[PDB]
Amino acid sequence: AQARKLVEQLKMEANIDRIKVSKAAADLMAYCEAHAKEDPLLTPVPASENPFREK
Amino acid sequence: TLSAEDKAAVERSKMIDRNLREDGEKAAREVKLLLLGAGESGKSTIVKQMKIIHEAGYSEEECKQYKAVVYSNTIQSIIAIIRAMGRSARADDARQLFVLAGAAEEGFMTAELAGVIKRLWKDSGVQACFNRSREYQLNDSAAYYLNDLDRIAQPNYIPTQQDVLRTRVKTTGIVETHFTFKDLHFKMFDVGGQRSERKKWIHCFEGVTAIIFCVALSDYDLVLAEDEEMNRMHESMKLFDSICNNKWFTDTSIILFLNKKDLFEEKIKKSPLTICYPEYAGSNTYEEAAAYIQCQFEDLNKRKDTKEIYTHFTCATDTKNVQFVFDAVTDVIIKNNLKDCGLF
Amino acid sequence: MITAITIMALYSIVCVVGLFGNFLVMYVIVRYTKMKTATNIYIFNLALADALATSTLPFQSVNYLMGTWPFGTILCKIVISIDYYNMFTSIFTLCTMSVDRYIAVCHPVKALDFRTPRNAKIINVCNWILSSAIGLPVMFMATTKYRQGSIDCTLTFSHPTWYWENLLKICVFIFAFIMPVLIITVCYGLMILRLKSVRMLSGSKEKDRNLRRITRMVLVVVAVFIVCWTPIHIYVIIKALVTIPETTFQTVSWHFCIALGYTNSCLNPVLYAFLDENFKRCFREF
Amino acid sequence: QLRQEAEQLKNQIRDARKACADATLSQITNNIDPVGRIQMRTRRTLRGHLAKIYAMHWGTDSRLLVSASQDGKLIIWDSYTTNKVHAIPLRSSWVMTCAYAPSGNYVACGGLDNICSIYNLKTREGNVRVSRELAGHTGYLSCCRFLDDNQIVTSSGDTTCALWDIETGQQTTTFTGHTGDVMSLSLAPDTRLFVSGACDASAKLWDVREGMCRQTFTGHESDINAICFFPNGNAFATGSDDATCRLFDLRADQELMTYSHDNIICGITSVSFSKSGRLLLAGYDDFNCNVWDALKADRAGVLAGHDNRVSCLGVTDDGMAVATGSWDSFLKIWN
């Protein structure tokens, strides 16, 4: 019964839509350079707007 | 420049620090133990031979934490029953509708809703239909919740350990037993219920005082039930070898127990030990075979200058079991105090 | 003339060795390892005691060299009070370290809760407080008197000068030599017998050489304390009893016997800190 | 019999993935500027845990965080002012996971007791009680994440994940199919999917509503300990014991990027992306965190300063800080 369930699960995983790696990597890049100014760990923010400062 | 909010937060964190400090001071005085072994070794009889204290149930620090659990379980069980008999008066229906309106709130059920279900108990067929409902997924202690909850109604409703164990969820995995012996506190952990992967939680201990590996001695002529070709004693030997030469347990001592002292003796008064060890033929007597098994089980310890193995025999032995564990633990404590003192 | 040269030289080398050792021990035990254990707090406080004790050596050295104390009564009070107070703290810290190790070995269940950093802090504060109680009479009794045209500063006393003088001699001989030696020998002897009775230090070659290593360290500590402190106390006692004439040999011997106690203060960081295996592990990463 | 059918079905899936690949992620991002050397400083150090920290989770307000350690405590901190708002004494000292409710009204934990305990942080009494104890797992609880104020998805040692109704106490949905101990799960940003990595070196995407598996990713070798979605929810990165992080993809159903180095041989315990997703952080067993560039597969920073194994790690929601815990009983906050 486990083999039949595994075959059915693998068949359901087989018949799914796939998009090319180029367009998905381009989408990842569009997300990365669409939010570069919103990443404080990427571009170091000024200490005026930094809530983690020494006391 | 800081107002009273920062001062209150600082004081709250200060008292949290005091609580954490005293909790860590109390916990560092304990002795942690990892009870290991194969199947049917005799660990349950070893723990039963301790018989000092074998449970928990602190008076106030954990009874407060389960106060809303009792009300939540009572409300969930009664709504499970009222949704279970479906799918003799309408006053009970009105009371149930009043229950369903206020069922979203928890914490203050002990007076008003308690009185409402107390008046709702006039029906006699509701318990019969609850007993009839054995198919729906509901706790069997619904009446065991409802019966003793409404007998007392207090604002600071803090019950004893009977109601805490009533709502307590049984632990399928780790089992903790706390016992004390001669002004020193122990804490035993049975990981036999964890059948998932030893290599993913065996590092969770990392600094237990000792390991109380138990080995049944009668398994020298008992074959494993899952393979029928390889011995049980060699499975115990492989498990002990994997426990000894673990990177996480590299310096901890092992209080090794050899369990069935009379069973293997009456076994070897008929069948020799050659079937378990074909390379061994010295005697079929009790003493020489026991010594040979112990020495063939101790040489698995690869490092013989840092890790010490203490071996004992059991099966209706007196308090010498607990005394042996205490002697091993005090030797480990002396070693740790020498290491802390800069003398080792 | 060369006797003053040799006395100045021995005071200088003892002072520089003690200051360097007890400063490097403090630097290691502050920067690399911390005061998160009882023994590290004890070692740091012993280092403070030894370093402040041996910082008075230039003053005594220049006092012997000139024969006249020009620093006034306030600086003499400060120097001699620091000397007595820090010698007593160093001796008390040695005693409490021996007591700590004896409790750790022979009484392990009680040492589970007694040996905590907070209790070590309380014991150290108590050590410095009792040394204050024993050294505030040195604060209120030291003065700079005049004799033979030269200026010298010593301890003055009441009208029964002999009684208070011999009382201070007694309270230094018993409370800093006799009581510490008995405590340290009893504690270490019981600890050594108990370690000879333990399983993990017997039954093999490596366990036996380890047990011999702890035994040798114990014997070295006791022998260094006894050899360094015996000649000065014996010299003080027999100078109180009989009248030793003032000569070159007795002056050189008296200053050498003074330097022996400060040599114990110099050798305390070597014997206690640098011979710890925790310190050896901290030096092993270098 | 049917094993050959399953083998040829898996080969068909592999061939579809191979024909689906036409350009490497390194080729697509070969013309972008490197992120440069990123050097964060320890702004805060959260002292107070006395034992081995195993997990942490930031709050949605980006100011509080809960951490769990093996002393049987569960401390909520104020990261801005280095305070302890709460300290919950756990019933079981063995805890391996902790979660923070998105509303902040609840907090979860679990471990070797096979129980996911939920704690009400905002009771009218003032202290912290227990709202519900979730039972039904025969293995240790290794991860838990709140969908919302009422539902939580958990992973267990019994090679299955599960979804719970907190106010009821039972499993509404069971996720089965891992042939190995699932160790960590991460929730999608839209709270409709989740992905979990297991000890069979496979990461499976599940559906919350219908409870079925959509994709399986088998690029890793030893076993998965870390997993975290990309901020857009169309990718995730998996840490493992073979000293490798791998970026997988939802729509492509493939392997995109491998973050590994020759002198790194220790396992990865935890991963988390930054807000933009350009910066994937990962904790390791060699006592420090390595900051990776998720587009270029090169190391941009090193977060040292932990004396023991960096076991947990998490970037806050607005991206202003990353907090890493460690086996040396200390938490650190970086910026």
Ligand SMILES: CN(C)C(=O)C(CCN1CCC(O)(c2ccc(Cl)cc2)CC1)(c1ccccc1)c1ccccc1
């Ligand atoms: C008196 N005895 C018997 C001691 O053993 C003594 C103290 C000797 N020390 C010498 C210099 C001194 O005279 C001095 C200081 C400043 C000035 Cl401006 C002028 C003179 C003050 C006293 C000791 C002997 C040897 C080495 C170290 C100490 C000691 C040991 C233990 C505890 C307390 C005292």
Ligand SMILES: CC(C)CCC[C@@H](C)[C@H]1CC[C@H]2[C@@H]3CC=C4C[C@@H](O)CC[C@]4(C)[C@H]3CC[C@]12C
């Ligand atoms: C009674 C009067 C005269 C004594 C004056 C000096 C006292 C206040 C000073 C001198 C040296 C000091 C100690 C030096 C080092 C330490 C270790 C530290 O981890 C805790 C405090 C502690 C233990 C200090 C306590 C205060 C102390 C004992």
Ligand SMILES: CC(C)CCC[C@@H](C)[C@H]1CC[C@H]2[C@@H]3CC=C4C[C@@H](O)CC[C@]4(C)[C@H]3CC[C@]12C
């Ligand atoms: C047990 C070990 C430490 C040996 C102890 C040695 C003691 C007893 C020795 C060391 C220095 C010695 C003194 C050195 C110088 C003099 C001056 C001389 O005109 C009379 C003897 C006298 C006063 C000596 C008496 C004995 C003495 C105090």
Ligand SMILES: Nc1nc2c(ncn2[C@@H]2O[C@H](COP(=O)(O)OP(O)(O)=S)[C@@H](O)[C@H]2O)c(=O)[nH]1
């Ligand atoms: N005569 C004799 N019988 C013993 C002894 N110890 C255990 N047993 C039997 O063995 C089972 C426990 O094994 P158990 O399954 O709990 O082990 P475990 O490692 O899974 S906890 C029990 O039914 C016992 O009658 C002993 O000394 N003498």
